[PDB]
Each structure stands twice: as C-alpha cells, then as structure tokens.
Amino acid sequence: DQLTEEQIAEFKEAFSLFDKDGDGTITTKELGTVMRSLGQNPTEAELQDMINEVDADGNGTIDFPEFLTMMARKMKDTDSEEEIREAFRVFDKDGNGYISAAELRHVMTNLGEKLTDEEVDEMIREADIDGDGQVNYEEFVQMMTA
C-alpha cells in the first residue's frame, strides 16, 4: 500500500534531508551534523550504536529500506523495548549492565509501590540465569519475547 508515488516521494524528500552527499547512503558525518543542528551533542559511540541497531546489512551505512524501518519504529509513541531498558539503566552504576541481586531486592522492597517479600524473592530467583547473583539484560528480552 506504500507503493503509491505520493508517500514514496514524501519519504524520499525526508531522506534527502539527511543525505547531503547525493549518493543514497548515510554516513556518520551527516547524522552527526543533523543531530548537532537540533541542539543535541552526539558522541561517536552512541551514534555508532544507533546506526548499527538499524543496519541489518552490516555495511555501516543506511539506505532507503533501512531508513523506512527506522522511521516506522521511531514514529510510534511507546516502545516497550527501550522504555524499560532505560529504566534499568536508571539504577545502573558504571554502565556495565551488571546489577547485583541485593540491589534489586532493596529497590523492589523499599522504593516504588512496594512488593511482598516472597514475590520479589521469587522474581530474583527466576532472574538469575545461572545463579551468580548478578543479572544481565537478557532477562529483559526473556520477558519481552512473549
């Protein structure tokens, strides 16, 4: 249904606002310039991860089909993939994604709207994929899988 010429032309014109190099490819410099003109300060690592997250080709560059997927995923209001991913980072300390079980037990016992001790204990028991007492972020994708 998107094959109609009007929406394709609209999206091509929108894509042209990022690619000032003519060729149908987006590099790091153009994205950095566009985000700089908006008042934000993108460092190399975060923007590299941002372009890699949509780049299924692996070439390190964004074409029109990748731009379509990126825009479709970003135009929606709530993205359950990232909203709780950032909530987990809120309690992170050194950005390693490594949270000890004691910290989780504390936060989900005093902070928030409270939780019964057996429920949080069961949740932490299910959280450790091995039992080392430290949880990674794959437990998040395990919840979000279904």
Size of the site for Ca ion (CB under 5 A): 9
Q: What are phi and psi of 80, to 5 degrees?
A: -65, -15
72 interacts with, out of Ca ion, another protein, none, CB within 5 to 8 A per kind: another protein
CA distances from 81 to 2, 15, 29, 94 (A): 26, 25, 27, 21
CB 102 within 8 Å of CB 114: no
Q: Which of 3, 19, 6 is nearest to 63 (CA)?
A: 19
According to the annotation, is 23 in a ligand binding site? Answer: yes
Binding-site member from 5, 17, 58, 96 for another protein (CB under 8 A): 17
Binding-site size for another protein (CB under 8 A) equals 47
What CA–CA distance (Å, rounded) separates 21 from 35? 16
Smallest Cα–Cα separation from 51: which of 62, 39, 59, 40?
Answer: 62
Q: Which of residues 77-116 bind another protein (CB under 8 A)?
A: 77-78, 80, 83-84, 86-88, 90-91, 107-108, 111-113, 115
Where does this chain bind another protein (CB under 8 A)?
1-4, 7, 10-11, 13-14, 17, 34-35, 37-40, 65, 68-69, 71-72, 74-78, 80, 83-84, 86-88, 90-91, 107-108, 111-113, 115, 119, 122-123, 126, 142-143, 146
